[PDB]
């Protein structure tokens, strides 16, 4: 049956300011199956406090969800966005760039 | 406000 | 401008795991402000927007009892088209229902929808005269007669011309503040060296109310349609919104392109370039 595969968008709500209060998105979308899998990622480590908004779809009845934490940039610290999903091989990491 | 169904089936 | 309000259900069947998974959203235009999950403790349609809070215990008392009313719809339609295909009891399928009404700038009715989808595709859809109904193979067919003989589209199409219309304004008023405001787009251009050769240009769309915006590059006044990286139209977490347009601009052409901007919070398309 049909699988459409999660597009993925990693990325701040405000831009990225070192120092500064912010919370890191990660957004997926187009996807079927709902079933999915999303992590948020600090220098490689899941991160436990993250929520997510609930399941609703487009017009095209393909899902959509938004992951989101609070964090406060920085010059060194990476994020990345981890989705896993059936039409996956293996979980998809995007990594957060502050100009994206 | 939600749809005030009988209800309905497929 | 104009204004929607949409259900969207979203049913999943959890084979050897009980009672499946069923999801209730509601919208106005943009932005969300009920919910129900079955998963959850509550068992009742919960607040998602501040000005939908401190509607009466009436009125979330009703919206519970309708929309468990329609999960235990879903519940059975499930078995029902399990049953029309001729699935296995094994495998687990998904059920989607959208319904709502359109309305134009004057808050009148423009368009009221109706619509299942089956494992992601379409099954049945009432068309917009709000009378027929659009079935493609067999087991919709079905379906269209069973609604057809309980004349569904009748009970369906006063709704969506009255109370969902009717509450859409009710909605839009109370929560003025929000639901009637227009944040234009914040706009800026980056520029960043891929190479010493070329680099790129990407124009932002920041924090702007609602969604729908239109965002194009152009070289010396043609289009870059194809040479525009151009992302999906995104949520910021706050109620508002981004996008953003890139091109890949050569050594010294950076004042031949411009960024566009159309969005319902401009006057005037705005025009940009870098320079």
Known sequence: ?100 | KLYQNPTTYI | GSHSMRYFFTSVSRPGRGEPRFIAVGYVDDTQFVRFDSDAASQRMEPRAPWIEQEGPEYWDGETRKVKAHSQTHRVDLGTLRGYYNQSEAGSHTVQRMYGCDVGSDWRFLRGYHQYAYDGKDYIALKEDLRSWTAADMAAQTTKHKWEAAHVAEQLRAYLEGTCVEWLRRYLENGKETLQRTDAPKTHMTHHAVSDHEATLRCWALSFYPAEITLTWQRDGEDQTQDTELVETRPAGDGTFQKWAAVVVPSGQEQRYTCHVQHEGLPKPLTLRWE
């Open chain 1, 1 to 100: 049956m049909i699988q459409r595969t999660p597009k993925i968008q990693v990325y701040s709500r405000h831009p990225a300011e070192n120092g500064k209060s912010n919370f890191l998105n990660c957004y997926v979308s187009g996807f079927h199956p709902s079933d999915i899998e999303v992590d948020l990622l600090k220098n490689g480590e899941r991160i436990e406090k993250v929520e997510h908004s609930d399941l609703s779809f487009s017009k095209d009845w393909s899902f959509y969800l938004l992951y989101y934490t609070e964090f406060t940039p920085t010059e060194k610290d990476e994020y990345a966005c981890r989705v896993n999903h059936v039409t996956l091989s293996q979980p998809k990491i995007v990594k957060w760039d502050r100009d994206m």
